[PDB]
Nucleic acid binder design. Structure first.
Ligand code: DLU
Ligand code: DLU
Ligand code: MG
Ligand code: MG
Ligand code: MG
Ligand code: MG
Ligand code: ZN
Ligand code: ZN
Lengths: 237, 66, 47, 261, 261, 237, 66, 47
DNA sequence: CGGGAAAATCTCTAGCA
DNA sequence: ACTGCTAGAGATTTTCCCG
DNA sequence: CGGGAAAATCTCTAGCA
DNA sequence: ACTGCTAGAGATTTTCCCG
């Protein structure tokens, strides 16, 4: 509340995002998002051949987390089943494909329509090469290639560790999806509160930002002002 | 430094149960987390809960909403 | 010591008495004629 | 009550009267009649009326097999969040269960699985799969589905959703995946008003963040506390109370009669 | 919310999302999402969570058939007291049930019987037996044992007692009669700490005595009460309240705004 | 409490029983029973022959309530089963029999031992004659004699009405058993309280009668006295 | 005369239930008995109970014991 | 009026909507395609 | 008026199949 | 227009008993 | 500070087979 | 030495909102 001027000064000086201001100056995320305002669903699909069997590989671009399994045939039904599974396990919004025969079939389009996925036609190649390397490493521990493929997926997702902080792909995708959930929560709160107009002390209508227990935060003429609940009225428009 | 980390730790909410009570209790505030026990603060009362009886979340709804 | 009467597995007839070895929350470990059994506390009575 | 006790034991050998009847009919105190009943092996036919509580740690998954339209559906649930994972399998075979569990371990941080004593779950192939992925197998008490009530209720919910959305699909496996999708992302409720997927993401991210934060706090905050004893480790202090860990026994003591060094 | 409602109905046709999910994902008020769910026939799959209560009048008896050791046991219970009457019968035949019910009517004041829709209980012979003895047949909702939960629990108790005392008898019928004796006279509890026989004697004697006493009181006490209306009949007066019966509708009104003539 | 002298005077004048004093002067039954102190289990068993079949008839002597059924043969097993049923339905304490072959068999003796019945070897003949009359009346309404016998039992127990107050046999037996239950309740209460001794104001030991909420009723030297709870002590001997 | 009969009527105790409550309530005092309804007095509160929901006894234990 | 969805007799599939005729404590009488059914209120939902 | 012990009350579950 | 219940095993609360 | 309405909470049941 | 739960339908209690 009292830190709104400090947050505005910090934004003017360092151009910090609303996350930093909300974490530092103890502000609600809507106020910080207004001050600063004043990929998670991306997947790539590819088919890879190994020892005469087809491996369908899905990678989460923003994290490198992979989803692969051996399919009996390179058929639109099998890849539609794979994509429906992927949508059922992760929040898949759009998939990138290579204009193959199995990706432009009507079954896959119907699966995307039902699962709410948009179809759009370099990371995938490196991911396939790394998956092949791990499969070659762990082939001797599995009789079938399908078991070895799942071993390689497990190893790449939770055992191999690299990056800035040295996290695995599973931790990265979990963090990314958590951040996306936070972003969606904030967007829903903004949409819910944006339909209100506030009159304070009576002055002109002011966009509502926060409806705290002891105060009401509003915006007037590109300036954020805090008024008490007992000196302002909020109406829905 | 340390106070920021403690504040972040206390920003998490814990849902927990007792040994003979089958209903999950409200979102108490997390104070300490261990391998097999968590320390909570539920309505000005500090309790120690086994890790298998606690669900520690954050609630992004609440976070991004005050 | 304790006496335990129990309903082991798909057998509606109650059996006992058995020696109580371990009492946890929800289940008990018992000994009945040199046989170790784990019975839920719903299906057991301890005296 | 020596005469009354003998006439009550003699009647109990014939009728097995409850403690109230013998207390009334022989002027016995309630404790004496209860002792008479408690010493009769033939009257011990009811267990205590409570329920246990399943493990709810973030690493526990409960697996079970259900049957629909003549097929076998292998279902796994994350206990802490309600996030489910189901797949139609050709048969209840240790190979299929081992493959499903390897997939599950490769997708999410599965630390331990709680299943019943079915043949597929007790196979050596599943044991080898768990050993390679570092999964600890917990087997329920035989013929006690209440030990896996979470996955049993999830079987019920999955079957209900499959019945809801069966017409939209032509095979059972497509409808099963559709029901998994609907349960994981189209049904809200629970602790945070979440879906299953949102709740599981929150649970795992919270585990990671809390682990890292507590590690940093314990690295920085290093003190010994004397109360009433030995040099107990300091866990949390404030609000007139101190939380300490002495000999791997965590106890909460007030700020009085305690000094931090 | 016109745009949001359409995008939620379109999603519900695919996923059948619960009201919480559509309220969260489309910014709908809870009432709007609940209306969306309530208008979908495919989501009406759960009844309200309560239970009814069986008739407990002194004249109601609940009858049922149970099976033990390959034989058929016909059991009747007096609902108000828990007094039971059981007998091994050759088969679930309307003749045997009619004979058993005629015996029951000749032994106790049986006014009405509540049974399920088994073949023996729905036979014309049983109907003729009930008509001759003036017994009113009440048939439960089909495949709803909760309508006769009293006799079902009595079947459970009788089987437990038979298991307790089976060794003392050589045939099943002797053990059944022994269990009936034990339940009726050797087990105390309930409302008055009674046995079943004591409780049923108390119930019937109380019914007779209260009927006679109330008949005498109504013969002597004859008054009309005006309150707020018509000449309501006086039932009970005192302690600042008056109980009256106007047009076969019994209501309790305070002594104020009421005059007795 | 205050009516103890009135109850003593009433007993001296009219020799009324404790029931009347307890119902009139508002006294606990123990006090009235002390002032006045200062069949329900009887059954008869007989075998009757009609149309070549044996009817086993049990009558409650104190009420005239009958229990009859047609048995396949005049055998100790059948009559033992009948008597075990009768004990299971009514509080049977002793049965009167006519020293027949089926009544002195070992099976019937064992049944009496298990059911707690004592065996002892004119009302029964008149009851049998009345049962035969009713059976002859209602035979035309039943194909079998066993159904007609049960019809006759029902009619005699609940339809035929006679006596002083014009009650049926079922009402009479219900009232008699209720009175016996009251008598047993009073006897148990007397036995429970008779093991106590009371010292009042301290005077000699006094037999305890009642332990009311606001007073204690005791007996000393064949005289009933009411003392407060706060001036007396009760001990168990 | 009438007062004695009323006192005898009020000497009986009734066990009863409500429409949505499955546990039997305590022994209220009987004031009036009808064909389908009984009038009771439970802890200084007068209620009308359907006859099918009431168990009217006397309790000879209590009677012969104060 | 009211819409009733119910689970009649040994059939796990829910049926409806039906016309509500009588609502008692514990059971309801309904009409579904000129067929009168009595269903316990546990196995019915009224809207 | 104050603890302890005993009694009463409340809670909760399996089986009825 | 019809309808879960019952009895026992623990846990918790009330009441009685001597101070 | 006071009602109404809406939201949150509590209670309770079937199915898991 | 291990362990009923879950989601929805009504009913009841809290809280918010304008006076
Ligand atoms: C062929 C007749 C007529 C038509 O229906 C069948 C089937 N049935 C089933 C049960 C039963 O399910 N008992 C377990 C139970 C479960 C729940 C509950 F609340 C009460 C309970 F007793 C009976 O008791 C019973 O008598 C019958 C029966 O007689 N019949
Ligand atoms: C041969 C495997 C291993 C050995 O035992 C059998 C039998 N069984 C029985 C049920 C069951 O009774 N479900 C209904 C239910 C009843 C009560 C409750 F609390 C939870 C409930 F789910 C299962 O679910 C189940 O998976 C099995 C199973 O798998 N097996
Ligand atoms: Mg299983
Ligand atoms: Mg199962
Ligand atoms: Mg039946
Ligand atoms: Mg039945
Ligand atoms: Zn016994
Ligand atoms: Zn729907």
């Amino acid at each position: 509340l009292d830190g709104i001027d400090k947050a505005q000064e910090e934004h003017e000086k360092y151009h910090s995002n609303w996350r930093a201001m909300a974490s530092d100056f103890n502000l609600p995320p809507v106020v910080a998002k207004e001050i600063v305002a004043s990929s998670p669903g991306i997947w790539q699909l590819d088919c890879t051949h190994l020892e005469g069997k087809v491996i369908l590989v899905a990678v989460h671009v923003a994290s490198g987390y992979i989803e692969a399994e051996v399919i009996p045939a390179e058929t639109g039904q099998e890849t539609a089943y794979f994509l429906l599974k992927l949508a059922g396990r992760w929040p898949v919004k759009t998939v990138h494909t290579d204009n193959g025969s199995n990706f432009t079939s009507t079954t896959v389009k119907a699966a995307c329509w039902w699962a709410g996925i948009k179809q759009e036609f370099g990371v995938i190649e490196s991911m396939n090469k790394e998956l092949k390397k791990i499969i070659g490493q762990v082939r001797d521990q599995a009789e079938h290639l399908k078991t070895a493929v799942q071993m390689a997926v497990f190893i790449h997702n939770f055992k191999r560790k690299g990056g800035i902080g040295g996290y695995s792909a599973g931790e990265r995708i979990v963090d990314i999806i958590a951040t996306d959930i936070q972003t969606k929560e904030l967007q829903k709160q903004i949409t819910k509160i944006q339909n209100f107009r506030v009159y304070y002390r009576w002055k002109g209508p002011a966009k509502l930002l926060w409806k705290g227990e002891g105060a009401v935060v509003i915006q007037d003429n590109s300036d954020i002002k805090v008024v008490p609940r007992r000196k302002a009225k909020i109406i829905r428009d | 430094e340390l106070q920021k980390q403690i504040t972040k730790i206390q920003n998490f909410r814990v849902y927990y149960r007792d040994s003979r009570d089958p209903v999950w209790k409200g979102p108490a505030k997390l104070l300490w987390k261990g391998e097999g026990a968590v320390v909570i603060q539920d309505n000005s009362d500090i309790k120690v809960v086994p890790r298998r009886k606690a669900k520690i979340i954050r609630d992004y709804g609440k976070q991004m909403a005050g | 010591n304790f006496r335990v009467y129990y309903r082991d597995s798909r057998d509606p007839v109650w059996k006992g008495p058995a020696k109580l070895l371990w009492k946890g929350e929800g289940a008990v470990v018992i000994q009945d004629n040199s046989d170790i059994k784990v019975v839920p506390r719903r299906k057991a009575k301890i005296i």
